Scaffold this active site. Structure first.
Site, short mmCIF file in Angstrom:
data_model
loop_
_atom_site.label_atom_id
_atom_site.label_comp_id
_atom_site.label_asym_id
_atom_site.label_seq_id
_atom_site.Cartn_x
_atom_site.Cartn_y
_atom_site.Cartn_z
N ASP A 36 0.71 -1.22 -0.01
CA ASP A 36 0.21 0.01 0.03
C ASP A 36 1.04 1.19 -0.03
O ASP A 36 2.00 1.27 -0.53
CB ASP A 36 -0.92 -0.09 1.19
CG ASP A 36 -2.16 0.82 0.97
OD1 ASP A 36 -2.20 2.17 0.88
OD2 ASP A 36 -3.19 -0.07 0.77
N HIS A 46 -3.63 6.10 4.07
CA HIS A 46 -4.30 4.88 3.50
C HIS A 46 -3.86 3.63 3.90
O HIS A 46 -4.35 2.81 4.52
CB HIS A 46 -4.52 5.05 1.95
CG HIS A 46 -5.14 3.75 1.31
ND1 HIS A 46 -6.59 3.93 1.19
CD2 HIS A 46 -4.99 2.64 0.91
CE1 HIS A 46 -7.18 2.71 0.84
NE2 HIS A 46 -6.04 1.96 0.41
N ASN A 73 -14.26 -0.30 -6.03
CA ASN A 73 -15.22 0.59 -5.67
C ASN A 73 -16.02 1.16 -6.42
O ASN A 73 -16.34 2.65 -6.47
CB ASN A 73 -14.50 1.65 -4.56
CG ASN A 73 -13.53 1.11 -3.41
OD1 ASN A 73 -13.96 0.15 -2.77
ND2 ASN A 73 -12.55 1.80 -3.24
N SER A 126 -11.19 -1.15 0.25
CA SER A 126 -10.07 -1.08 0.90
C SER A 126 -9.82 -1.53 2.62
O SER A 126 -8.93 -1.53 3.05
CB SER A 126 -9.29 0.35 0.68
OG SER A 126 -7.92 0.28 0.84
#
Ligand SMILES: [Ca+2]
Length: 279
Positions: free
Chosen positions: A39, A69, A161, A224
């Site tokens: 990530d 994130h 998403n 996520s």
């Protein structure tokens, strides 16, 4: 063990029904397992990680998480308050820049890294990788995810998403890894969650409180956020001896809450990750 007033997602993962706020889990807590979070990085110095997080790799000028994130995701995996596997070892691989972006080529390199790198880590109970990222279909990206899995790492990836069929996204569309859709605290499919035959499981993804950079916390939403619940769950189950990297996705599907989610499109699994813990 019982953690009162836990984030709703933690409580949901140890419950047969929505609407409770206590998280129940075996105190082994993923000890002796490892989770790679691939990530934007991890702020390892966050008190919530207790010394159990470390950056192992970056493809950029720094290994710091300048975004937050990756730190949020890692927190859901294994932070003391916001984590599923509160005693796992967390390894950060920075394939995404501080804008959260990453070339597919760097992402692939990061996956191949972890497949080798687990051989330099101490993880007697098993190895998990949490990939809360994705883009359009790429066979090379899917293949890299498939290698990581074949190497003996439980690979968990975000469905995406786009409120769309995940077959058109990578690594979400790779059959051999665990593809994770998002749900909300009322057991609805999250409005943004991808769906489709390639999904293996759902986890909490809407309004998920976890760690953030600057040593803080925040609530954010995405597949996520669902992914690290499943990754942490796998790590927890591996330390319990219930499953292995190769069979953990299946095991989680097998032991899931079934038929409980709403707005699951016809042909998509109706399975919500659940630790089946009896306190
Ligand atoms: Ca899959």
């Amino acid at each position: 063990a019982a953690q009162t007033n836990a984030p709703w997602g933690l409580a949901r993962i140890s419950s047969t029904s929505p609407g409770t706020s206590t998280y129940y889990y075996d105190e082994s807590a993923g000890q002796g397992s490892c989770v790679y979070v691939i990530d934007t990085g991890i702020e390892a110095s966050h008190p919530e990680f207790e010394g159990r997080a470390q950056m192992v790799k970056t493809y950029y000028y720094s290994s710091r998480d300048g975004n937050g994130h990756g730190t949020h995701c890692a927190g859901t995996v294994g932070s003391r308050t916001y984590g599923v596997a509160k005693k796992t070892q967390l390894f950060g691989v920075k394939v995404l820049d501080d804008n959260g972006s990453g070339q597919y080529s760097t992402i692939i390199a990061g996956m191949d890294f972890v497949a080798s790198d687990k051989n330099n880590r101490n993880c007697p109970k098993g190895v998990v990788a949490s990939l809360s990222l994705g883009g359009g279909y790429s066979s090379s990206v899917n293949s890299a995810a498939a290698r990581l899995q074949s190497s003996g790492v439980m690979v968990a990836v975000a469905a995406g998403n786009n409120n769309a069929d995940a077959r058109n996204y990578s690594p979400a569309s790779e059959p051999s890894v665990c593809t994770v859709g998002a749900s909300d605290r009322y057991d609805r499919r999250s409005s943004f969650s991808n769906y489709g035959s390639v999904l293996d499981i759902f986890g909490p993804g809407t309004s998920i409180l976890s760690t953030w950079i600057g040593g803080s916390t925040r609530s954010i939403s995405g597949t996520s956020m669902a992914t690290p619940h499943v990754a942490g769950l796998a790590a927890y189950l591996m330390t319990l001896g219930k499953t292995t990297a190769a069979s953990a996705c299946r095991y989680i599907a097998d032991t899931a809450n079934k038929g409980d989610l709403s707005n699951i499109p016809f042909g998509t699994v109706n399975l919500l990750a659940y630790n089946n813990y009896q306190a």
